[PDB]
Amino acid sequence: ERLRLRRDFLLIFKEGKSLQNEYFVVLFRKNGMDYSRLGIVVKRKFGKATRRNKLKRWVREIFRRNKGVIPKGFDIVVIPRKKLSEEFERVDFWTVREKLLNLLKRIEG
Predict the structure, then answer these.
(1) Which alpha helices (DSSP H) does 1-92 contain, by range?
(2) Domain parsing of the chain, residue ranges
(3) Listing from the earlier edge strand, what are the strands of the sheet with 24-30?
(4) Residues closing a segment before a gap in the chain (C–N exceeding 2.5 Å)
(5) How far is CA 87 from the centre of its chain?
(6) Burial status of residue 60 (CB atoms within 10 A of its CB: 0-12, 13-18, 19 or more)
(7) Which one of 3.40.50.1860, 3.30.230.10, 2.10.260.10, 3.40.50.1980 gives the CATH number of domain 1-109?
(8) What is the CA radius of gyration of the chain?
(9) Any signal peptide, and if so, which residues?
């Protein structure tokens, strides 16, 4: 998952596909590899280091533990949505996991 966002975010956004739910947008494109790579784009307005780092930790953990079931061969960008910033402190880890995994497991084909 060393996805280098500064170069590849534009390309994924323009050429990839997207899925979303109330908490996340996930953008994805085929990478031509036998593994997927993750990047996380957290808007500055989501908060200071503690808050943004908490979200990024959760996201990294969910991807790492679930790599074996997430489809292979995609570059994936996870973007938290306004509603997740609104609600963060009231959403527990298992809900974040559920909501993220439902999009990740639908990346096709």
Answers:
(1) 5-15, 49-65, 82-87
(2) 1-109
(3) 17-20, 24-30, 74-80, 37-40
(4) none
(5) 17
(6) middle
(7) 3.30.230.10
(8) 13
(9) none
